Design a protein around this nucleic acid. Structure first.
Lengths: 49, 57
DNA sequence: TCGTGCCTGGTGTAATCC
DNA sequence: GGATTACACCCAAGACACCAGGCACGA
RNA sequence: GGUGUCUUGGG
């Protein structure tokens, strides 16, 4: 490599927000009863606003 | 405007009541029907209604 | 008769119209 | 002088919600 | 397949 590069050991630390604590989808599914508008939240096959 | 907005209809005479879709009672714990707050307010209205009537008799 | 048992009602930063 | 009525979007998750006196019913 | 608050968070 034509250039010289910085290089060492440095201290990282893992963080919670894992890709399977936010990814999501919704084909159709559960609806509220008060409105039939598709429901709230992730753990419920919810939908987006 | 007479035929749609009448100046003596601004005082409720006979209060309409919404079908249960507007106030579907949520199940308190999937067996106990924790009533939608419209149902309770209508109950208190209906109680005070009858307890107004009975006095003028 | 007396306490139980279900049971219903009930409290000691503002800047803008009117 | 009073009054109201406003005063960021979206998402995710975890944790918690009845009291006491008032009349009926029974061995 | 509750629903309502509050709490802590992420961009």
């Amino acid at each position: 490599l034509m250039a010289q590069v910085f290089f060492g050991p440095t201290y990282y630390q893992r963080l919670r927000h894992m890709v399977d604590d936010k990814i999501h989808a919704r084909a159709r599914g559960p609806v509220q009863v008060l409105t039939r508008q598709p429901v709230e939240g992730r753990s419920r096959d919810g939908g987006l606003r | 405007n007479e035929d749609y907005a009448r100046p003596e209809w601004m005082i409720i005479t006979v209060l309409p009541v919404p079908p249960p879709q507007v106030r579907p009672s949520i199940a308190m714990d999937e067996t106990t029907q924790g009533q939608d707050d419209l149902t309770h307010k209508l109950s208190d209205i209906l109680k005070a209604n009858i307890n107004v009537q009975k006095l003028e008799m």
